[PDB]
Design a protein around this ligand. Structure first.
Ligand code: HEC
Length: 82
């Protein structure tokens, strides 16, 4: 649905904010970082779904219980946070 709704329902808000650094990077900072990079949406989608570690630091993001569709919706929305 609404990406902010997914962000709540899927537990992203425990570790991320749009404008504030929490455990995970702020979405505003992600958007800025991956600005101007080819394939950023698809890569962020797979990382949201499957987890990552060492992209932003040593703390891992565990895998999230989201579908490909949800992951894509989230990735697109994160990248748009200007
Ligand atoms: C705490 C256990 C987390 C949960 C729940 C979510 N994220 Fe996360 N995220 C977390 C960390 C520690 C990191 C940095 C990982 C790293 O490799 O350094 C991230 C990273 C992201 C990113 C940036 C890309 C990446 O580093 O993999 C995005 C776009 C992101 N996270 C989004 C996101 C979404 C949409 C979440 C709910 C489905 C979510 N995260 C949850 C920590 C945690």
């Amino acid at each position: 649905e609404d990406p902010e709704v997914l962000a709540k329902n899927k537990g992203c808000v425990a570790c991320h904010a749009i404008d504030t650094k929490m455990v995970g990077p702020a979405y505003k900072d992600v958007a800025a970082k991956f600005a101007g990079q080819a394939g950023a949406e698809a890569e962020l989608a797979q990382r949201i779904k499957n987890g990552s570690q060492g992209v932003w630091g040593p703390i891992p993001m565990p895998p999230n219980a989201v579908s490909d569709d949800e992951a894509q919706t989230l990735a697109k929305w994160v990248l748009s946070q200007k």
